[PDB]
Amino acid sequence: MTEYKLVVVGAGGVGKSALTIQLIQNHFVDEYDPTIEESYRKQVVIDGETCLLDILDTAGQEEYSAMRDQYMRTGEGFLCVFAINNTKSFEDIHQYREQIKRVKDSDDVPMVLVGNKCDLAARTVESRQAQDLARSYGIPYIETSAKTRQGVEDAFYTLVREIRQH
Amino acid sequence: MTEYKLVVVGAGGVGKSALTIQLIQNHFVDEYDPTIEESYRKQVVIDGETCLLDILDTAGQEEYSAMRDQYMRTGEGFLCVFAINNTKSFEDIHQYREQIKRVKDSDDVPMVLVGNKCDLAARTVESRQAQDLARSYGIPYIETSAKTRQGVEDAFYTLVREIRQH
Ligand SMILES: Nc1nc2c(ncn2[C@@H]2O[C@H](COP(=O)(O)OP(=O)(O)NP(=O)(O)O)[C@@H](O)[C@H]2O)c(=O)[nH]1
Ligand SMILES: Nc1nc2c(ncn2[C@@H]2O[C@H](COP(=O)(O)OP(=O)(O)NP(=O)(O)O)[C@@H](O)[C@H]2O)c(=O)[nH]1
Ligand SMILES: [Mg+2]
Ligand SMILES: [Mg+2]
Numbered sequence: 001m002t003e004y005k006l007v008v009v010g011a012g013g014v015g016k017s018a019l020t021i022q023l024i025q026n027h028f029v030d031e032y033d034p035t036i037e038e039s040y041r042k043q044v045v046i047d048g049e050t051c052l053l054d055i056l057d058t059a060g061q062e063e064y065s066a067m068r069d070q071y072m073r074t075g076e077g078f079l080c081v082f083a084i085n086n087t088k089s090f091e092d093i094h095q096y097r098e099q100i101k102r103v104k105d106s107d108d109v110p111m112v113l114v115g116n117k118c119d120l121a122a123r124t125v126e127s128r129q130a131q132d133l134a135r136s137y138g139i140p141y142i143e144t145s146a147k148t149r150q151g152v153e154d155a156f157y158t159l160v161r162e163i164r165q166h
Numbered sequence: 167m168t169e170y171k172l173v174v175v176g177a178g179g180v181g182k183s184a185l186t187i188q189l190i191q192n193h194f195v196d197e198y199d200p201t202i203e204e205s206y207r208k209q210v211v212i213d214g215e216t217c218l219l220d221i222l223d224t225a226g227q228e229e230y231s232a233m234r235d236q237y238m239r240t241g242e243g244f245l246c247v248f249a250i251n252n253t254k255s256f257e258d259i260h261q262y263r264e265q266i267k268r269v270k271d272s273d274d275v276p277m278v279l280v281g282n283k284c285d286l287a288a289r290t291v292e293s294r295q296a297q298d299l300a301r302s303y304g305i306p307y308i309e310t311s312a313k314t315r316q317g318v319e320d321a322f323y324t325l326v327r328e329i330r331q332h
Contacts, residue, residue, distance in 0.1 A: 047281075047293055047297065047307060047308055047309045047317075048250075048281070048284065048292075048293025048296075048297075048309050049293055049294070049297065084214075115213075115214070118214065126214075127213055127214025127215055128215070130214075131213065131214075131215065131330065135330070135331065138331070140327050140330075140331065141213060142213055142327075143213045143214050151213075153320075154319075154320060154323070157320070158324070158327075161306050161308075161324075164297065164301070164306075165301065165304070165306065
């Protein structure tokens with residue numbers, strides 16, 4: 001069956017994991033639990049096609065440096081997450097994008113920008129700001145809550161759909 | 167606020183209306199009720215942006231001929247629906263696409279192809295067939311059920327998102 005090798009990337013603490021566990025296990029994780037690397041495989045149906053979601057959950061910062069090159073060479077599509085109440089995670093998006101273009105020999109790589117935690121009142125990252133960025137990158141933007149589950153399927157399925165169209 | 171002038175197009179009986187009423191009124195309409203033309207306006211939030219969904223629901227066939235040119239000149243994005251158990255509605259998609267390119271002076275117009283009624287066992291339109299078509303048009307494809315509500319938000323929001331990116 002078609003397999004879609006997806007990897008979830010972004011700054012430490014932004015909800016990369018809580019977002020992947022909502023998809024696979026249908027529940028919010030409200031725990032302190034920093035990822036070294038996790039992987040999730042799931043037979044799923046998206047728009048009538050039977051496919052396996054092969055997802056890599058990654059680390060926020062760590063000695064993950066050129067340690068990242070290896071999985072960014074193997075991922076087919078990227079979820080690039082920041083938190084809407086953490087301005088420096090929004091800003092670090094440029095570093096993750098460029099390194100993925102660098103190891104990919106590509107300016108067009110399947111990707112979607114995700115502003116997570118849209119449930120929290122108190123954002124510092126305005127959606128206009130983030131949607132303008134997603135437009136400059138030629139990237140769709142989708143806000144999410146791992147807490148509420150708002151948009152989580154929508155972010156993962158839009159990315160499976162960026163990969164169908166490339 | 168941003169307004170997104172969307173119109174729902176396709177063959178008679180395919181679920182264009184049931185799909186629009188699930189979005190606006192949160193309920194399945196399981197009635198025989200052929201549209202001349204209906205319009206729905208709704209203040210909604212999509213990915214943090216406050217916007218009005220101005221949707222035009224249209225007729226399947228009728229004396230709607232160059233009678234369509236007028237609204238296809240005014241719609242910003244199109245939802246192109248067929249039914250997955252009705253081969254000729256899948257086939258009539260080419261006629262709706264081309265006329266929209268014709269009155270639009272455009273090869274790239276925001277659009278998504280929707281195979282509706284994915285709940286019914288007994289399809290005659292295979293998702294590979296329809297996803298290949300959506301790929302040839304440079305269009306995303308999303309299956310839906312107005313009955314179940316599966317994918318309805320997903321089809322309407324992906325189209326609002328095609329319009330953000332154009
Ligand atoms: N309210 C709110 N909190 C969330 C959301 N997503 C995650 N959290 C919280 O944010 C914190 C970090 O979540 P986690 O998934 O561990 O983030 P991470 O990006 O995977 N951290 P890391 O880079 O170290 O692996 C946790 O307290 C989690 O409950 C969200 O949608 N909203
Ligand atoms: N089981 C199933 N039936 C559906 C679905 N969508 C619509 N229907 C049924 O299909 C029939 C037509 O629905 P309707 O919304 O009126 O279609 P239309 O495309 O708007 N007809 P028209 O072109 O004349 O205006 C109705 O019986 C409706 O309940 C769906 O998701 N699945
Ligand atoms: Mg984690
Ligand atoms: Mg109708």
